RNA sequence: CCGGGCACUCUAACGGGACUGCCCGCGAAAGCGGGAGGAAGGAGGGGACGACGUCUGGUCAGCAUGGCCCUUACGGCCUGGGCGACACACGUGCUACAAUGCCCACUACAAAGCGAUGCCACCCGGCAACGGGGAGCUAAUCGCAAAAAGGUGGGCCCAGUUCGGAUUGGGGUCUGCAACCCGACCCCAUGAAGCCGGAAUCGCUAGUAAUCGCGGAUCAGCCAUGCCGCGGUGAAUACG
């Protein structure tokens, strides 16, 4: 969910970038 | 509301068969404002609906709406130190709304996977006799024959 | 420990992360605007007479 | 015993069977499929035996697992406890050791609910 | 040779030109089935082009920007509607009982201090 | 030749504007007309009491409105006669090129 | 932590002290202030006597403490238990 | 992108438009019911705006101010610590307990805002946080900026699971003189409780609830899941 650091949805909701959610 | 009487929503018909029995099922099936999934929900019921049964999807739909609707119930009632619950009629709104809503739960009851297959398996039971709102409508109506003493107290 | 505080913030200090922002009409530390230099309370009573220019009441 | 003396479950992907071994994530579950020249998408009950062997040793050569991955991190946690560190004091006691709150929550540290007289 | 509508709708705006053709339909340089892909209530924006039976006889040029999807499909609709009651005064029929031509004006509603949302007030308890 | 001019209230701003876009026709230069830039709103927002009353807001919005103002031609003789005008001093003007 | 690109930081007051002590006698009772200095090996040997907010605690260095902070070696509150 | 045009959208100033204004009925009248036309119909939807007074209501710690009290200290400076404690109890929230779901890849569609010890395009190196070059923009010009839910395709197949992401070990980045007490973020490993919640209790009548993301103030950095705003998708029901 939306709780995990390691997927998409964790990533947008924390608001960061990085091997999951790349730029 | 105290001052005057609520104005009825008039949905707007689907646009596949121009029914607004559809649209209002569609609404109860649809949660958190997804109305594209319950439109394709409600799409691939009909779908299946075809398949086994293969009649018209819309007669097996209005037969399942008409077979759920119920003509009594209880509402509770404290009179002096005791409650009652008093049997009353139901208005054809209500009807249609206790039917969809009765529908719709008994469908996500059951135990197959997939939505889309629940929902068609819950329609074509309670096209015949059977299913889970057909068991709720009964069951409803039972309570209100067995209180049928209570009726003045309306 | 009020007048002191107002003067020292008011000084530079060694490290630059130890400057930090103060109203400048009554020394509050706290939310202070930085387009006007003041606390939330200095801004609505300089509002309400008509002393901040172009600002005026919201509402839409 | 399968992989590093543990029995990674059949009727899953090898990757998904993978990360049922202490100390082997998603990723190292994939680290060792794009190093041994093994589909992802097969299931474990459905593996040649060099691609078994291949697979096992590469995994208990590349990385430290298991018992011995346990006994490094109670000898960390044991170091830290001894020297007298401040995560040592917090280990010692239970509590969270990374800075967190203790007047509420911090459940998961120490436990059920001790309710006393108030 | 054209006629013009526009339509707006919840942030979003149409502009609609109608020319003679087979009825080729076309949003923003794309087609009507790619734009709104995968979107049921699509069809409704062709509705005025129904109700009058020149549904196969216009080609329509659509350009939408803003809002969303379902609100730029209403907009679609609305353009349409006034594009058609444009090409002659005698399509205002068929069009102003079904509403066709009436703006919708139901926007979304401003926050408030106070409350989580428009309406949504904190969880109360006394005590 | 761009002008552009900005200010809190409008009004003074639309007199200013509209006093250039006349002046600016005494030697005609094809003046193209006072154009409105998009207002920027700056809005902040206080608690209404001194002390605890988080619940209770007052807004406050300040807003700058820009006009621009182009002449095709220079036009030296009414460029000259653009130096000493009739400027509102809430209004503040950029001239470039 | 502290990046790399950067070396680990030490007051350069309290390095003075070991410093000048591992050629003039190397062994006595140092008093510092300086929690947030990194030990470093050469550290290694002395008793530092660190202030926890109200007194300073003697620190005796050892090899397995040299990387961490002086400050987590002198606690700063004083706790027991309920009751 | 250019010439060109202001058609259209839009931008921002000035105006019009809606007023029971018209027709039928009811009634002394005020008004109430129905209809036409109109984008809008009976206060069109939402703000700003809070009477005489009440509560010995809150604030001497925002400011101001009567009295009382201290005057090599109850004043002032610095370092370090504390406000971050923890057998427990309560309020407000966030994330879930899954298939109307989760994960992965590609592909659409907003609004309101902010930006010169600033916003940072693009290229190079690292899985990444980020670092090194380096345009454009004092900004309807350049940037933040990717919207997400959605749509298409594939994987998972009812499990404490490809659900859930707490806790802990290790390796790092950045801000800052300085991240131990006590920062944020990236990567690897760990993978807790949780299977829809007792007595009870809360919000909401329509672009509302629900659900999805985006911006701003404070601010070196940030413990923001808060607050103030913005738009996307979009219900059910009101007999009484
Ligand atoms: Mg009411
Ligand atoms: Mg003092
Ligand atoms: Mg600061
Ligand atoms: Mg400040
Ligand atoms: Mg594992
Ligand atoms: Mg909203
Ligand atoms: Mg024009
Ligand atoms: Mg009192
Ligand atoms: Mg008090
Ligand atoms: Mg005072
Ligand atoms: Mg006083
Ligand atoms: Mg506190
Ligand atoms: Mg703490
Ligand atoms: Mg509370
Ligand atoms: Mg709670
Ligand atoms: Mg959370
Ligand atoms: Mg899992
Ligand atoms: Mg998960
Ligand atoms: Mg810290
Ligand atoms: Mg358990
Ligand atoms: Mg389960
Ligand atoms: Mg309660
Ligand atoms: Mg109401
Ligand atoms: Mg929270
Ligand atoms: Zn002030």
Known sequence: ?23 | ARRRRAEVRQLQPDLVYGDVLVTAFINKIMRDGKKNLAARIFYDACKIIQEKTGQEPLKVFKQAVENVKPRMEVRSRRVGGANYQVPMEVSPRRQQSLALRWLVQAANQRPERRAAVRIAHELMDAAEGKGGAVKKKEDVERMAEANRAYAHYR | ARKALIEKAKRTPKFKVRAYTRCVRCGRARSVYRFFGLCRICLRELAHKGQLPGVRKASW | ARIAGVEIPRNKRVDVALTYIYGIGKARAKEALEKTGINPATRVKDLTEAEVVRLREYVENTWKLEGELRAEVAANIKRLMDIGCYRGLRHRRGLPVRGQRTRTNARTRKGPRKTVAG | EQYYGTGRRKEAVARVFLRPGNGKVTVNGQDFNEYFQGLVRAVAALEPLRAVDALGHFDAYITVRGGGKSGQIDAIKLGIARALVQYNPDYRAKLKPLGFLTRDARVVERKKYGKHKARRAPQYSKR | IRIKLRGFDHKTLDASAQKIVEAARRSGAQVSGPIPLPTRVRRFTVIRGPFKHKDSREHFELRTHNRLVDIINPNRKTIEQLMTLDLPTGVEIEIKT | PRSLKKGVFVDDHLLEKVLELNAKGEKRLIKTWSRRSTIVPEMVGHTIAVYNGKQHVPVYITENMVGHKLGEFAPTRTYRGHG
């Open chain 1, 1 to 23: 969910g939306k709780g995990d650091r390691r997927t998409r949805r964790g990533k947008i909701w924390r608001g960061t970038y990085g091997k999951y959610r790349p730029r």
